[PDB]
């Protein structure tokens, strides 16, 4: 009902937060801001941010450099940052199993090193999704942080990442303690609404409808709760405005905005306005978060 996320902060029981959607809408700018708000409010705890998107752009939002290992933000000590890549797992592995792999391939070729060089250049499809799951599991095991925030990649990939543990436990248990229990506990938490939650981001256009419906349907399957959604790139103009451009775009948005409210009225829908400049630096973040707790005052508001 209320267009805000204030109900999220009060529930300290949360452990996993997600932010997903299409590209070019503010998945990164939104996630990073929400984390800062939760940290300054709970200074006696730890918090972690993490990026699973290959187009790592968090460093450009904070104006600070980050690496493949967890670091600390200069502006605040409570918060930490991190970004996962695929050029470190292979680097650390740099084989024993790969060698045996060739033997299996050569075998069938008969019944029907040089390959090591292929490992150098990489270019192995799916490696980004495979190695990423490995890194998280190592970080998920540690129990020093309280919660974790994710800046996920497009929906086309984040879903396949969520289904991975459900299939690994299946084949593992079908072919077969510390490892299986870890993953089993993880999939258990991602499904409980009191611990996990998924949030969406979109813009007032036509493609938002089809994408949002497909997203919710695929989440209800996995039994994951979607309790809210975020809209961005909104204009605060009206027919009374003299600028023809600002007037035309507004009429195009008042249409789709009303549609979404009627369908998912049960969800917490929030509206974020458009800003003059970009969002770079802690200065602009703490101002972007105020719109998520206390709603902005638009022209048509009352």
């Amino acid at each position: 009902m209320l267009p805000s996320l204030h109900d999220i902060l009060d529930q300290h029981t949360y452990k996993w937060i997600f932010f997903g959607g299409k590209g070019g809408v503010g998945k990164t700018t939104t996630s990073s801001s929400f984390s800062v708000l939760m940290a300054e409010t709970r200074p006696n705890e730890k918090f972690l941010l993490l990026s699973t998107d290959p187009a790592h752009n968090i460093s450009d939002a904070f104006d600070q450099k980050f690496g493949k290992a967890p670091t600390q933000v200069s502006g605040i000590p409570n918060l930490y940052a991190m970004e996962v890549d695929a050029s470190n797992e292979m680097k650390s592995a740099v084989x024993x199993x790969x060698x045996x792999x060739x033997x299996x391939x050569x075998x069938x070729x008969x019944x029907x090193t040089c390959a090591s060089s292929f490992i150098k250049d990489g270019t192995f499809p799916g490696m980004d999704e495979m190695w990423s799951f490995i890194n998280l599991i190592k970080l998920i095991d540690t129990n020093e942080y309280s919660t974790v925030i994710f800046d996920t990649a497009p929906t086309g990939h984040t879903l396949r990442f969520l289904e991975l543990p459900e299939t690994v436990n299946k084949v593992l248990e079908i072919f077969t303690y510390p490892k299986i229990d870890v993953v089993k506990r993880i999939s258990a938490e991602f499904r409980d609404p009191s611990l996990c939650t998924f949030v969406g981001v979109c813009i007032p256009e036509f493609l938002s409808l089809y994408e949002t419906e497909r997203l919710v349907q695929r989440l209800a399957v996995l039994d994951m709760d979607c309790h809210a959604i975020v809209i961005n790139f909104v204009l605060d103009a009206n027919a009374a405005t003299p600028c023809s451009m600002c007037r035309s775009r507004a009429r195009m948005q008042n249409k789709y905005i009303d549609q979404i409210n009627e369908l998912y009225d049960d969800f917490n829908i929030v509206l974020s306005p458009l800003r003059h400049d970009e969002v770079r630096g802690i200065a602009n973040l703490r101002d972007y978060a105020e719109t998520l707790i206390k709603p902005y005052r638009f022209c048509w508001s009352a």
Binding site: X97, X98, X101, X104, X105, X108, X109, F124, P125, G126, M130, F133, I134, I137, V168, V171, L172, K179, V183
Partner: peptide
């Protein structure tokens, strides 16, 4: 697609093999 199928088998093996790392 025949040789590519072997490549598909080569890539399909990496997926199954990488599972042991878990």
């Amino acid at each position: 697609q025949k040789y590519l199928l072997v490549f598909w088998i080569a890539l399909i093996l990496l997926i199954i093999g990488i599972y042991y790392v878990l």
